[PDB]
Amino acid sequence: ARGLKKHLKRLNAPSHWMLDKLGGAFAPKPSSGPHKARECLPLILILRNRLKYALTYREVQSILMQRHIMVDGKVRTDKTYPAGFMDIISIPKTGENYRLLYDTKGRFRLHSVRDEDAKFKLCKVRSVQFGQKGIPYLNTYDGRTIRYPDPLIKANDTIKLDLETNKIVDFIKFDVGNVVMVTGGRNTGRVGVIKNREKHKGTFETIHVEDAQGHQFATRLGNVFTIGKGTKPWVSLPKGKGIKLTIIEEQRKRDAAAQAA
Amino acid sequence: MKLNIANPTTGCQKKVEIDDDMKLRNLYDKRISQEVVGDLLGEEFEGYIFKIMGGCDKQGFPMKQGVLTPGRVRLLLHRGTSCFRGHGRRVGERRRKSVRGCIVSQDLSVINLVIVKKGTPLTLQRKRARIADKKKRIAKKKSEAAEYQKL
Amino acid sequence: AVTLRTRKFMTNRLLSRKQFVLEVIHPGRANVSKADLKERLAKIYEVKDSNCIFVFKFRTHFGGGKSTGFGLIYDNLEAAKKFEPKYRLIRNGLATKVEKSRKQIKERKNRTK
RNA sequence: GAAACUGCGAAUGGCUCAUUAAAUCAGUUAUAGUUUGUUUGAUGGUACGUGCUACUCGGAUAACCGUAGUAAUUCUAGAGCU
RNA sequence: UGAUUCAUGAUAACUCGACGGAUCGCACGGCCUUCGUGCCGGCGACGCAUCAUUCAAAUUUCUGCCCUAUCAACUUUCGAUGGUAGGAUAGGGGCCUACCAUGGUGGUGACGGGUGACGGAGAAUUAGGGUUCGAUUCCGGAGAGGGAGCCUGAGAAACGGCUAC
Numbered sequence A: 001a002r003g004l005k006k007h008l009k010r011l012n013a014p015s016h017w018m019l020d021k022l023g024g025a026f027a028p029k030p031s032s033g034p035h036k037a038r039e040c041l042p043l044i045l046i047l048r049n050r051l052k053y054a055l056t057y058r059e060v061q062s063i064l065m066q067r068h069i070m071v072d073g074k075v076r077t078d079k080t081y082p083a084g085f086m087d088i089i090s091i092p093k094t095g096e097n098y099r100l101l102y103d104t105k106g107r108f109r110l111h112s113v114r115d116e117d118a119k120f121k122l123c124k125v126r127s128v129q130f131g132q133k134g135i136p137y138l139n140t141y142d143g144r145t146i147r148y149p150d151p152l153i154k155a156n157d158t159i160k161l162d163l164e165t166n167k168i169v170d171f172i173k174f175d176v177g178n179v180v181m182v183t184g185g186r187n188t189g190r191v192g193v194i195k196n197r198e199k200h201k202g203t204f205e206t207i208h209v210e211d212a213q214g215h216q217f218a219t220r221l222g223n224v225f226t227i228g229k230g231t232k233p234w235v236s237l238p239k240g241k242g243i244k245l246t247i248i249e250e251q252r253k254r255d256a257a258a259q260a261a
Numbered sequence B: 001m002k003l004n005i006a007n008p009t010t011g012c013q014k015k016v017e018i019d020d021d022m023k024l025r026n027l028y029d030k031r032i033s034q035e036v037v038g039d040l041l042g043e044e045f046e047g048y049i050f051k052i053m054g055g056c057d058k059q060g061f062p063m064k065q066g067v068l069t070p071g072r073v074r075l076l077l078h079r080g081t082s083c084f085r086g087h088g089r090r091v092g093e094r095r096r097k098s099v100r101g102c103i104v105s106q107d108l109s110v111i112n113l114v115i116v117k118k119g120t121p122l123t124l125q126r127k128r129a130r131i132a133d134k135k136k137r138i139a140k141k142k143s144e145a146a147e148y149q150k151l
Numbered sequence C: 001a002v003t004l005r006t007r008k009f010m011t012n013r014l015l016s017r018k019q020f021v022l023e024v025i026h027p028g029r030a031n032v033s034k035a036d037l038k039e040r041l042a043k044i045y046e047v048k049d050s051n052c053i054f055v056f057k058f059r060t061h062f063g064g065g066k067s068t069g070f071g072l073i074y075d076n077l078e079a080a081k082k083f084e085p086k087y088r089l090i091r092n093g094l095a096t097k098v099e100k101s102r103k104q105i106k107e108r109k110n111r112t113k
Numbered sequence D: 001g002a003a004a005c006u007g008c009g010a011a012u013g014g015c016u017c018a019u020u021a022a023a024u025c026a027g028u029u030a031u032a033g034u035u036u037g038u039u040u041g042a043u044g045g046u047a048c049g050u051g052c053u054a055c056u057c058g059g060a061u062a063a064c065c066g067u068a069g070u071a072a073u074u075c076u077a078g079a080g081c082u
Numbered sequence E: 001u002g003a004u005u006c007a008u009g010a011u012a013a014c015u016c017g018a019c020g021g022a023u024c025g026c027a028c029g030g031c032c033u034u035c036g037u038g039c040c041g042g043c044g045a046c047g048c049a050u051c052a053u054u055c056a057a058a059u060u061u062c063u064g065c066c067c068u069a070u071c072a073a074c075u076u077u078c079g080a081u082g083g084u085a086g087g088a089u090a091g092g093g094g095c096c097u098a099c100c101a102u103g104g105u106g107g108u109g110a111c112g113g114g115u116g117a118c119g120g121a122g123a124a125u126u127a128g129g130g131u132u133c134g135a136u137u138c139c140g141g142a143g144a145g146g147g148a149g150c151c152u153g154a155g156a157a158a159c160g161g162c163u164a165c
């Protein structure tokens, strides 16, 4: 082409949106934003698809034009704003809060929470480096750039981030022994504990992560995101506690729910 | 041949018809915006001096200042300069147009002629808003630039 | 005798309405009209005004004797004008429509001045 | 509020498969060898004053009025405003 | 950082500097210093500049494609393969220039010809192994009667833009 592309045809959309292949020719094209448009969920989907506060593309438009919806602390009018991992979606009119985290099946969930968990998010740092006049600052994987961090926060670490004062209020030093949620691949969502990290000079490094109930799996360092120091999380895990399972097991669970029903 | 007069001193313009060679011999063979003596044009223009400037012809192709021929040349003209006033033409567009030259000659049809000689609190609020907001960026600067210093 | 059954009901303050799926059971009847169905809903949700009721997409299942549909109730008529499709307002009589002539619609206007 | 000046867009989509045989292309790499309107986040002093804390406000152009040329068309000229 | 004379700092200067707000909304509502739209000071709309991010491209590594030898040599003066210095580009590079060397590919099929040949995801048939198809709605590319050259613009060698034949 001779420039950018502004359309997203439905069959080409990320599979984890669960859009239906006959519901129309196009999909919502994720606007440029803090998340990488293949690991995001736009606002249109959250309202009309999941929450069903709307029935059409135009109805979700109106809702934002009343400004009921706030994302990550700030009011967003954009229809296709790219919400992502560990954002907060809050509707003060209804008085509800959500974190965005993954199913074990690797799909975003709106995890309902109180106000006290809305005050903060978690972010992993992309890099820490000097800048104008040697003033230290850090990149996150959320687009954010925080200047003047602890000299302890190195690359790949994770930070607590108050949305009111906006600076680092805590940080986890990414290393072996903490709990992590995976944000890509076939293992995305699966939480567990770093058991080993083997590096390879000139390539990606592999993380070894084990479910609380024994099952062992591996990803590459890109798709890893520490939640808490040690076994305990610093956020509320979703409806399933990050433990992925065989197809037989959920078959057993239904009939086990179908013997009581 | 047909002449369209105007004056900036008052703001009135008028079209006349003349067809006499000797009344236009000192009209032929000259150029736009260079003054012409008025007396040749007749006995009822004395003291009046015209600045001859502009004119169109049979085929309607205007004179363009700066092209030295009683000809009809094909120039590449930008939308915004004289003799090209395209509307809705996608800025950056040009054309090769046909324009008569600025030498006043037999082949014009209308000559254009002009007469030279007749015969707050908002700004205050908004100004000091910025100044208070420039002074805070250095207020914020020092507020964190030394907290990290103690560390 | 008919029975009116609302399922998947949820009240949103964002568009200031309550939403649901209408199932209407109409034995003997060919189909219950939306005007007739308009009345029954107004008398089950106490709405004080029959015009903030909007229903559509009635399907009338195979075999006869049952129909689905969808219902919107607003609590304010002002709200029912801002957050409503302009044709669904027409279906309830709150507006009237017009037509076009596609020729001339802009093409010779673009040339004039 | 129409017109109009200004800003942005019209480089996406739609159509087709003519040329094209490691070429396009696919999986997989790289950019420490680059540009990147926009989004999101951060950031921003000094112009002259002999840095001893800011130093004053320009005409002219559309829509419009009006004279016109050309058979000619979002062809085109000149004057009066703002 | 796997790896940088890296990030970044200091210094000496250099530029006929792109820059560093003469812009626009509602809402009022604390209090005089001359009680003077009076000192304030808010939330915002647009805008300029650096870094990061995002939406992207541009090049780019490895491997992989049908038939044909009644196609065994092809490329190299005038870029063919490399070197050094430049020029140009957004940037690497014979991309182009000057000088230098004589290289580069080939029976593991170069080069050349055919294709009623865009490539893939796929399709028909299928015991298995296969054979044949793939213009077409998804992805990548290319073109707008045939060639070529451009303006604007962040982005086009654009054709529902221009210029020439």
Ligand SMILES: [Mg+2]
Binding pocket: A028, A029, A030, A031, A080
């Ligand atoms: Mg979009």
Ligand SMILES: [Mg+2]
Binding pocket: A001
């Ligand atoms: Mg296209």
Ligand SMILES: [Mg+2]
Binding pocket: none
């Ligand atoms: Mg910004």
Ligand SMILES: [Mg+2]
Binding pocket: none
């Ligand atoms: Mg060389």
Ligand SMILES: [Mg+2]
Binding pocket: none
């Ligand atoms: Mg070189």
Ligand SMILES: [Mg+2]
Binding pocket: E117
């Ligand atoms: Mg072909």
Ligand SMILES: [Mg+2]
Binding pocket: E135
């Ligand atoms: Mg064909």
Ligand SMILES: [Mg+2]
Binding pocket: none
């Ligand atoms: Mg044709």
Ligand SMILES: [Mg+2]
Binding pocket: none
């Ligand atoms: Mg093209």
Ligand SMILES: [Mg+2]
Binding pocket: E159
């Ligand atoms: Mg072209």
Ligand SMILES: [Mg+2]
Binding pocket: E160
């Ligand atoms: Mg056409």
